Point group: none
Chain length 42, copies 4
Amino acid sequence: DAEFRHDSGYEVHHQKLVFFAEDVGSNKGAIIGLMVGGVVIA
Amino acid sequence: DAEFRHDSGYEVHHQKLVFFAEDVGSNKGAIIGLMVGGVVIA
Amino acid sequence: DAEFRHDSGYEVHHQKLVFFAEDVGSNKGAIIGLMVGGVVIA
Amino acid sequence: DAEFRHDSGYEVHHQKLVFFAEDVGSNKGAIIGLMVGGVVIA
């Protein structure tokens, strides 16, 4: 077989931004942090 | 009628902390603020 | 009908902003999004 | 089975703390809760 199913099942590639600016697989790594804080004064 | 249904339907008053430290209805007022921030480095 | 409405002596505050920086590396960037929402009753 | 698992070259970080102060007024207090969660893949 010589098929390269990228968008299999459903076409998810809507933003060709990654094609426009190219890609290197991973930008060294990946860092994500979520900060949640609530203040209650009463 | 002279009934004072406080916990009507379901008894929600489980914490008598408000009875222990008493209450003044409202502590001048009420202030609530939620801060949400996310960081993505990649 | 307005059952959960004694009055309107409150003020709502909301602010959201996002900041994106690509000056982290040639193939690395950082983006942060901040959303704050608050309600003051007085 | 582990389909969504290429490797485990990541580290998860999580911290939560709450601070309560009643020295705002005789009948007024302020409490703040902070929760931060982050994941680094490298």
